[PDB]
Design a protein around this nucleic acid. Structure first.
Ligand SMILES: Cc1cn([C@H]2C[C@H](O)[C@@H](COP(=O)(O)OP(=O)(O)OP(=O)(O)O)O2)c(=O)[nH]c1=O
Ligand SMILES: Cc1cn([C@H]2C[C@H](O)[C@@H](COP(=O)(O)OP(=O)(O)OP(=O)(O)O)O2)c(=O)[nH]c1=O
Ligand SMILES: [Mg+2]
Ligand SMILES: [Mg+2]
Ligand SMILES: [Zn+2]
Lengths: 474, 496, 276, 17
RNA sequence: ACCAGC
């Protein structure tokens, strides 16, 4: 903080390093020395300019703390002053690694060290671009940690191409391999290392097994209620966002709940619901009543009857015996809870409902960022994701609930919903027409099969709640 | 550590004194041992005494090993606790008295703990939110097991526990005793146990301290958030099975709506001045004093006294605001309070006097007064006119959710462009709700009123159900005839 | 300095027209008549609606460019992962529906014909794939141009590289990305195809129903048509397989408008030239 | 701001006066 | 000084 500490006023002395394995000759050559001030022996590193002017000190104590002597520059490199040329340099992460490489090479190769570490390595490598132009090969030598991989990935972007090569180590870094006696395996990594391949691009031939693995995987889940839908959809696979829409109160939640029950009690798939329209008890009673082919909430006398004769447990054990269902209790925390539902529990189908409250500033950027995050969550996971949405107000003509055929550009809020959803299914019925229990399924978008239009017809039952495959001809 | 025995000098025994590797000796016979403010308070200056706490029960040795000492400065009693570092120096202090005067002296860091200056290696650790429970666990475990405590409380656990990561990383299992939730710690390692009392001090002072120690060594898993499995729904559904409020005025409505439930949004609409307030007022008067339910009204069109006069004139089957002599006669003979008492003896009616300030008042009416049916009128003053109404409907749907309240909302209609107007008997559609298009998306029941004031019968109305999630029966419910002499509209039997 | 006089430029102009031109399209003749192939340093922008087949045409052009000419092609598929975008090209080469048939998968596993299908196309290093910010992607493309030595760079589904970042105003970020990509294509001199999307019309029919597209129908900004060289729009109706091509802007030539008609095959996946 | 209906005993006749 | 053993 005060000033550059002179070795005369701080009792400087050049010694060896027994605990790390460095003799006094290397620390004499570099300038890493030891001060005796305030009783406690302080370790201190010296920084120099291109000419040799002392500009900065790095003071560290016995208990792993940091102390800067003043203005720490961005072009501060430990070891830059000693070398002014060469064909092969080695850039070390810390400061003991550079001394270790100087110990194992008898002061031959130009080896330097960083001045910031792995936190601000990109700034000090962008500010030292003019120094690396006079060289021919650069060997990056960082830690075998996740932060070390992040540093060797992101700090190798502001470097000149064709001259960067990355070596690997079995230890944390080179110093423990010097302590464990791996002095022969590090010299081969100095001489022959691996080039700047693993950035993220792949080769055309390295996928040959993995495409086979995906060839041996990815079976679609068959829908229920209609066989004409599966003839142009072929199920639902991993990474499949299926959008469901209709008019206001036309049977979205009923069809989705029936699809969830038919996937639960007949396939054994672990299904995670996130119903936000109603709470847990109402949808639980709806599932229990729908499995027993009755309307549970629509009969107070039946609810009074089934609790007296003790047959409620007979319906509870046949449903929740295997615990295949996992419900949710009512913005970025929902993504983490769905991530825990997928990874921590192990579900295969995730169902949401009523996305308009979730997007409730500018709603378009919010719903676009939300759809991007759900698409990225569905990507590289292998999960069916069912999303329920609503429609907007038409300008002229009749209403959507009165049996009007709906188009694909009627999804409210933005246009980004149809640009990322794979299969969009719309439901159509007329409650004021002749038959208010005959529905129409319309495939608006299908990325995989490509067959759009009217799928089939189903007939709703007002007594049991089980809509059946009808045989109506339009 | 013990090495061997030496002959003592005080007691003069042969094998009574024991020598240690630290250089000190100890005799078993003679019992002789050898060898803001921004100011840290000195121990001997402020009359530091290691007194044992009496009213709750803490031994003297725990206060000596923890650094919780009593100051007698200025004639009062302070309880100073000390927070240290890994080096073994006093970092900060905390002063507590009978009035809980929080005088935190010294450099109080954001990652300050208590009891970390002695413990670096181990297997288990217990983290509490206070200091008395931590010393209580030290009393139960005789000050030999690693127990730390937060220095800032359970309100800022996202800062103190997050800054200390490598200290908690050195152990194998971390047990929490906060409330009877911080996920910054690594997963697969943190256990949370549940005590049958408020904290550990109540189990200590009520003999349930065994249930402390049974939960320490046998704590339960993490269980992060409200992800509820299907097994935990055994008694909640059975409690939920053990009700539709009847719509008074017409019997054709209840045949296809089956009343309203807990958390039910009812929307009432008609044309411009077709009598929404009269119909909703009749339902409120027939539901409040005739069914025993507490109803909260929020009539924003008129004042409190005017709707009180309406209610009083309605219930007595007269027209109060349509005659001055009828208003004058009822006060000159003392029959005014007779209408007051027989209607307001039960206090089931609560009126409102006149946008986020409304939701707090509705929460105070629902939770505090304990009502069941809340009625809102004249939404136009409350509500760009698309984001505000959508946010308002979302907040009211969230308020009606998980509460058990029937929320009635009166809305309006938009102006038509072609054809006949709504005052001449036009059949209204579902997409005529002005303001937004989400009003028919969150409402669970939609009721429309249709009448023609210029046709053959200017007092015949029609009820149209537009949306019903419970059954799915929409359309014309029936016909009712309005009275131009009493105000009470009656169910008729008109045919098309 | 950059004050280059026109007199000392004779050898550079002589060697400039010596190297290039070529890389013809496929599927239609009017595309070759109006665009004269794809050239180095150009920006080709393919537009469609939603699910109109804007990816299948680009993958078919990529197969014809990587097979018939052997150019090194770098793909950036952000719509799907690398496990699927390399799978569909095998079925497109073998004229079948590889992803759309569960029965053929076990047959090519058991018979070992998958090894021969992988060797008959990927015997050369002409396909460089990538899987999934905005600053590291241009570094990947600079690695593909300099280190890998690519010739045609395909940037699929741009709508998730300008929306996946946290920005206050998206349009200036779109402008900066567009001008930096244009500077990259000008400095390197590489064939570049970039796929974007359209926006919602205010009235009338839908783009999935046979709507004639306008040049102002681009979604997000107005620099997509001001910093590009060729704009190719695809339109069809759902005859559910009659697709037509509209050249909206050509900087090299001048002939714009309707180029032709193509038909979609349900058994092979190719885009056959139609007659109408 | 919320006034119950019980406290309107001497307010209605005060309004009518 | 005490506790336990073998
Ligand atoms: C399909 C259908 C449903 N119904 C009834 C049963 C359904 O529970 C009720 C509507 O309930 P939902 O199925 O929940 O309606 P929705 O999901 O489409 O939309 P929202 O919840 O936002 O209002 O309609 C019929 O009466 N006849 C029918 O043909
Ligand atoms: C062009 C075309 C495609 N299809 C089928 C083939 C595919 O399964 C699907 C479209 O293929 P894709 O190329 O995958 O659709 P897309 O790229 O336009 O979608 P997005 O913008 O979301 O990325 O439709 C036809 O059936 N007839 C056609 O004419
Ligand atoms: Mg619903
Ligand atoms: Mg596509
Ligand atoms: Zn003694």
């Amino acid at each position: 903080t005060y000033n550059v500490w002179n070795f005369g006023e701080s009792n400087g002395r050049y010694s060896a390093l027994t605990a790390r394995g460095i003799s006094k000759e290397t620390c004499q050559k570099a300038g890493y020395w030891i001060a005796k001030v305030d009783g406690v022996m302080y370790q201190v590193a010296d920084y120099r300019d291109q000419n040799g002017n002392i500009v900065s000190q790095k003071v560290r104590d016995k208990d792993k703390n940091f102390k800067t002597t003043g203005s720490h520059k961005s072009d501060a490199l430990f070891g830059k002053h000693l070398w002014n040329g060469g064909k092969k340099i080695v850039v070390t992460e810390g400061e003991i690694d550079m001394l270790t490489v100087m110990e194992l090479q008898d002061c031959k190769y130009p080896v330097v060290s960083l001045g910031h570490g792995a936190s601000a390595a990109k700034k000090t490598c962008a500010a030292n671009y003019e120094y690396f132009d006079q060289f021919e090969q650069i060997i990056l030598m960082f830690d075998m940690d996740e932060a070390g991989r992040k540093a060797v990935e992101e700090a190798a972007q502001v470097l000149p191409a064709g001259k960067v090569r990355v070596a690997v180590l079995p230890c944390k870094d080179a110093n423990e391999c010097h302590l464990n006696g791996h002095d022969r395996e590090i010299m081969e990594q100095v001489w022959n290392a691996g080039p700047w391949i693993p950035d993220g691009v792949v080769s055309a031939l390295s996928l040959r097994e993995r495409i086979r693995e995906h060839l041996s995987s990815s079976v679609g889940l068959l829908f229920s209620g209609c066989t004409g839908i599966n003839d142009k959809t072929l199920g639902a696979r991993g990474g499949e966002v299926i959008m469901v829409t209709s008019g206001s109160g036309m049977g979205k939640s009923t069809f989705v709940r029936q699809q969830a029950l038919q996937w639960g009690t007949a396939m054994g798939k672990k299904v995670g619901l996130a119903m936000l329209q109603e709470s847990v008890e109402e949808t639980a009673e709806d599932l229990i009543g729908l499995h027993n082919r009755v309307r549970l909430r629509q009969s107070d006398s039946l609810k009074r009857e089934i609790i007296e004769n003790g047959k409620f447990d007979q319906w509870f054990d046949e449903l929740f015996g295997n615990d295949t269902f996992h419900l949710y209790d009512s913005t970025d925390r929902l993504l983490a809870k769905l991530a825990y539902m997928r990874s921590g529990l192990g579900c295969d189908v995730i169902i949401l409902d009523h996305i308009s409250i979730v997007v409730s500033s500018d709603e378009r950027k919010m719903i676009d960022n939300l759809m991007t995050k759900l698409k990225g969550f569905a990507k590289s996971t292998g999960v069916v994701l069912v999303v329920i949405c609503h429609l907007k107000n038409p300008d002229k003509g009749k209403a959507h609930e009165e049996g009007r055929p709906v188009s694909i550009t009627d999804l409210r809020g933005s246009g980004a919903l149809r640009q990322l959803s794979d299969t969009i299914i719309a439901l159509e019925r007329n409650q004021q027409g002749d038959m208010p229990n005959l529905v129409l399924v319309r495939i608006l978008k299908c990325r995989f099969t490509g067959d759009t239009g009217i799928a089939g017809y189903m007939e709703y039952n007002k007594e049991t709640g089980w809509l059946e495959p009808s045989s109506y001809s339009g």
